[PDB]
Design a protein around this ligand. Structure first.
Ligand SMILES: NC(=O)c1ccc[n+]([C@@H]2O[C@H](COP(=O)([O-])OP(=O)(O)OC[C@H]3O[C@@H](n4cnc5c(N)ncnc54)[C@H](OP(=O)(O)O)[C@@H]3O)[C@@H](O)[C@H]2O)c1
Ligand SMILES: NC(=O)c1ccc[n+]([C@@H]2O[C@H](COP(=O)([O-])OP(=O)(O)OC[C@H]3O[C@@H](n4cnc5c(N)ncnc54)[C@H](OP(=O)(O)O)[C@@H]3O)[C@@H](O)[C@H]2O)c1
Ligand SMILES: NC(=O)c1ccc[n+]([C@@H]2O[C@H](COP(=O)([O-])OP(=O)(O)OC[C@H]3O[C@@H](n4cnc5c(N)ncnc54)[C@H](OP(=O)(O)O)[C@@H]3O)[C@@H](O)[C@H]2O)c1
Ligand SMILES: NC(=O)c1ccc[n+]([C@@H]2O[C@H](COP(=O)([O-])OP(=O)(O)OC[C@H]3O[C@@H](n4cnc5c(N)ncnc54)[C@H](OP(=O)(O)O)[C@@H]3O)[C@@H](O)[C@H]2O)c1
Ligand SMILES: CCc1cc(O)c(Oc2ccc([N+](=O)[O-])cc2Cl)cc1F
Ligand SMILES: CCc1cc(O)c(Oc2ccc([N+](=O)[O-])cc2Cl)cc1F
Ligand SMILES: CCc1cc(O)c(Oc2ccc([N+](=O)[O-])cc2Cl)cc1F
Ligand SMILES: CCc1cc(O)c(Oc2ccc([N+](=O)[O-])cc2Cl)cc1F
Ligand SMILES: N[C@@H](CCC(=O)O)C(=O)O
Ligand SMILES: N[C@@H](CCC(=O)O)C(=O)O
Ligand SMILES: N[C@@H](CCC(=O)O)C(=O)O
Lengths: 254, 254, 254, 254
């Protein structure tokens, strides 16, 4: 039960976003949610989707995580509008198709670094600014994938950005631990989202989960949200620096 | 929210058992609990500890996991008495002191296999029998420690039994996944229990968590309990084959 | 260059055995070799295979690793016959077909412990006895499979026994390290051997390596033997408690 | 024996460099070596160092890996001067001292992207340019540290860059495996080098290996060079996507 709790959810674009699975769940557990977005199109989609939520106010902030000022100022504005928060859910990542859809060895410098910037470094600077609204401690959760841990066909530069994200979680864990800020990741299974369209062979990835994963079925966004609720709440008070695979068991097999 | 759920908890000896932290947690969440014990002295503690629970009936079964017949019969009687169950918490391990307290390379054959039998194999046969009471699916959780993944000073033969246990979890996950039974581990941080007195150096293991783990404190039985509730509930539906470290972040650092 | 080195190689059964690939390599590199076997039939193969090698003397010993007396007297005879040694290549596993070719949850207690005994515990007692003949230090290597790190269909009880072995290596590396005894594993890809016939679906496992492993081919016994030469020699002087995958890269992908 | 082999060694700074240990070993084994260096003002010192080797001529190229042009043009010149190569030892990394010595949460975007640039991305562009000189296959090795697998105090931004590097190696291995190019990492224990002065608490780190690693000693640059010889030669055919810890076993303990 997350009554009197407040969470910042970053990275909803539409109803299929993993972040929206998080939000339906936290919303049904009673949490007050605040939302961040990059594109105005996503804000419009948040205004719509909010009609399905209990949230009695829209708290929507534009934060492009590529800009120090937008992050610095977004979170500072949040602290002034709703006060102290209990956690962040980070569900942001990006890489160019042009790098994604070529040989990994052909990845461009700017594409590699763009993927690092949005997909990894964004969590560090969000943590630093969000720390400022958690004087009592809290919980930060980032969304990753099995491609950070193993080379997965066609995931390429985003795989290296995920490996980077996952180490980011650990180093943030050790750093903000003494402040009672826990930092963790959910390694979600593949899930048809707007961004899934960027991954070559994604239909064959889906199929292979069903055929080979222990539960012999794919996961959904609500399943990610149910584990986010665990990590973002007191239930997981002794868990930081961890990576939970919400993935039907597929991480455990070969 | 486990009203109308039933969980079999194996391995309570006294008030400081990890499994008793699992029990107070699931008891407060509204679960019906069934307890298994080995020694008569443990059943005596269980009858006492039940007075602190909300459980309106004592369901207590002697099950020494060295005995196929006792596991087989124990569980069949559980099903005759309370019907189908939603899960099992496994909190059972054993090795001889004489093996634990010598050089690992001096470990006896009989003591090595003893520690495999009670501390690993017992999971497999418990799953097999518990599966008969979970026709519609469920959740099995075992307790491990970090010495199953890395060589920890003085954990010796139990280290290899926990490596085995952790592989047992994954192979059980892949085998019983199709029946909608999930199987996971909790890697608990060090916690003062009756069995902790078996581990050479345990006070220095304690202190080292506090000074080096991200959270700079040790965990307790309730914290393991809260992660058990998550794992034993529908909040962790897409999660199987997993190993959650309830250990203040210690697994993540070096 | 391994002239004036002596290595004990355990577990050749015929020309296909992984250990005979190791032998050919160590033999081509100049090492003196001592062989142990279980079955009469394997001693006859050894006698025949020795004509293909450069060894001027045949040093063959019957050691059934289920017997402490055979391991203890085996290595002691070895000391009397050839003197101090530089290392041991261990290449021994067994599980019942009846357990392997059924569901893992259905594994018998005696089959599980049988598999631990031959396939894991054997390394501990071998290390203890070989250590007596390595007063200046040396190197011990064991043969593992990826299914000790992940659940692989049909590997079943042997996957739990390899998980046990792999931990065994790490605890022994720690225990014996001050004695300048290094202990490592090689995780070999699937290879056609007499024992590969016990694992259901082997050919499917072969094909999937060709299809999906980075090198898009299978490895062979000589490739394992060349990595053994590295681990058994001074080239690997800083390396212990390690698991080297000689599997065309299959361990790094998913 | 590496006669009629040619290797490019990137990252010799002085006689304490891990890349110079690599050079000594490979030089001793009869390889032709080519050296790359960052700044023209330290060509004269590198030339003096290499008088120690049995190289008949200096093959020295200035390549700063922050520039694609320098990498592209450097490897093209090497091809014209020397012909086809058999592999590359990558020993390059960099982070700001100013990001190294703060809270990891306080890392600047510029400093976090620079470390990724020099310490991870450089491997990718190097492999792409070196692959042009390895039409029949070959071997690429990069140097990482345990800090990329766990959070290590004071390693901060470099730890996340090594996590990146380590995934880089996995993705490169999958990409390039069909070309018969293998890509691996050596994870070196702590070694007193020019760059080690930049890590806070280095001697404490030394002392900890001495005290806690299985071998109870530190490793040296020549021990890295010997694992490098194995990884760069045919002894390691079948090994790719791998991370060999040359660290006295410290990685396997906790
Ligand atoms: N779908 C899967 O199978 C899968 C699996 C595992 C992990 N994940 C991870 O889950 C997370 C979310 O992806 P998803 O599948 O839910 O896709 P999604 O619905 O497309 O969401 C991705 C979000 O990233 C945001 N974003 C990108 N760059 C940004 C920037 N510079 N500043 C602010 N926001 C930015 C997008 O916002 P705008 O549209 O407003 O630009 C969008 O809301 C990512 O971390 C992804 O890697 C996905
Ligand atoms: N305490 C820690 O720091 C720690 C840390 C990580 C993981 N763990 C793990 O947590 C679990 C629980 O142990 P604990 O530390 O809570 O100690 P505990 O209170 O001493 O419980 C150990 C339990 O194991 C039971 N057991 C031993 N052999 C058995 C058998 N043959 N049949 C049935 N039960 C048997 C004992 O029952 P009887 O007394 O009736 O014989 C006792 O209930 C173990 O798996 C342990 O390895 C503990
Ligand atoms: N083939 C693969 O795909 C593969 C892959 C990864 C790992 N491995 C591992 O590689 C090792 C060798 O297997 P292999 O494939 O080379 O098959 P193999 O030729 O059939 O050799 C297995 C050996 O185990 C010996 N052995 C079994 N029980 C023994 C006992 N109780 N005492 C002494 N020796 C005993 C057998 O000796 P006797 O015949 O005399 O009884 C036989 O020589 C094993 O550890 C295996 O698990 C194999
Ligand atoms: N020392 C250790 O304990 C240790 C442990 C594990 C891993 N490692 C790794 O081993 C590798 C070598 O480090 P080291 O300890 O040998 O230190 P080092 O001798 O100082 O070598 C680092 C080298 O990287 C070069 N470099 C930095 N930026 C470059 C650039 N932009 N372009 C081309 N070269 C560049 C440096 O060149 P300049 O001198 O001209 O600036 C220097 O030659 C690094 O990857 C390091 O992370 C070191
Ligand atoms: C394969 C499962 C999977 C993993 C993901 O990280 C994923 O998310 C993204 C992938 C690529 C981009 N991009 O190109 O900007 C963006 C995102 Cl948010 C989607 C997935 F379907
Ligand atoms: C080091 C943290 C820790 C890990 C454990 O597995 C643990 O449990 C046991 C240890 C030894 C035995 N035995 O010898 O019978 C039994 C158990 Cl239940 C206690 C711990 F203190
Ligand atoms: C799948 C790759 C693979 C891994 C192995 O461990 C392997 O070795 C054995 C497998 C089964 C038994 N047995 O049942 O007695 C014995 C051995 Cl020696 C063979 C393999 F083909
Ligand atoms: C602590 C072990 C250790 C790991 C390393 O990667 C290492 O190398 C570097 C560290 C920092 C920088 N820098 O800030 O530019 C550069 C390098 Cl080359 C040295 C080490 F002493
Ligand atoms: N191969 C096509 C289709 C992928 C799919 O199977 O979903 C692509 O790269 O998008
Ligand atoms: N070293 C003592 C005491 C351990 C402790 O509690 O610190 C022992 O072997 O039990
Ligand atoms: N699947 C058959 C054939 C084995 C193989 O495919 O190699 C079996 O159970 O043995």
């Amino acid at each position: 039960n997350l009554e009197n709790k407040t969470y910042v959810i970053m990275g909803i674009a539409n109803k299929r976003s993993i972040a929206f699975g998080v939000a339906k769940v936290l919303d049904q557990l009673g949490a007050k949610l605040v939302f961040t977005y990059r594109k105005e199109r996503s804000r419009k989609e948040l205004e719509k989707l909010l009609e399905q939520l209990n949230q009695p106010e829209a708290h929507l902030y534009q934060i492009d995580v590529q800009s120090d000022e937008e992050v610095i100022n977004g979170f500072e504005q949040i602290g002034k509008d709703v006060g102290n928060i209990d956690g962040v859910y980070h569900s942001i990542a990006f890489a160019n198709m042009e790098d994604l859809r070529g040989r990994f060895s052909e990845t461009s410098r700017e594409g590699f670094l763009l993927a690092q910037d949005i997909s990894s470094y964004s969590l560090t600077i969000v943590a630093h600014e969000a720390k400022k609204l958690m004087p009592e401690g809290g919980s930060i959760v980032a969304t990753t994938y099995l491609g950070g841990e193993f080379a997965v066909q066609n995931y390429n530069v985003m795989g290296v950005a995920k490996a980077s994200l996952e180490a980011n979680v650990k180093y943030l864990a050790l750093d903000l631990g003494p402040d009672n800020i826990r930092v963790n990741a959910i390694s979600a299974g593949p899930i048809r989202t707007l961004s899934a369209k960027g991954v070559g062979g994604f239909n064959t990835i889906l199929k292979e989960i069903e055929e080979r994963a222990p539960l012999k079925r794919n996961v959904d966004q609500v399943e990610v949200g149910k584990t986010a609720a665990y990590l973002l709440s007191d239930l997981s008070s002794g868990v930081t620096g961890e990576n939970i695979h919400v993935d039907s068991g597929f991480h455990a097999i070969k």
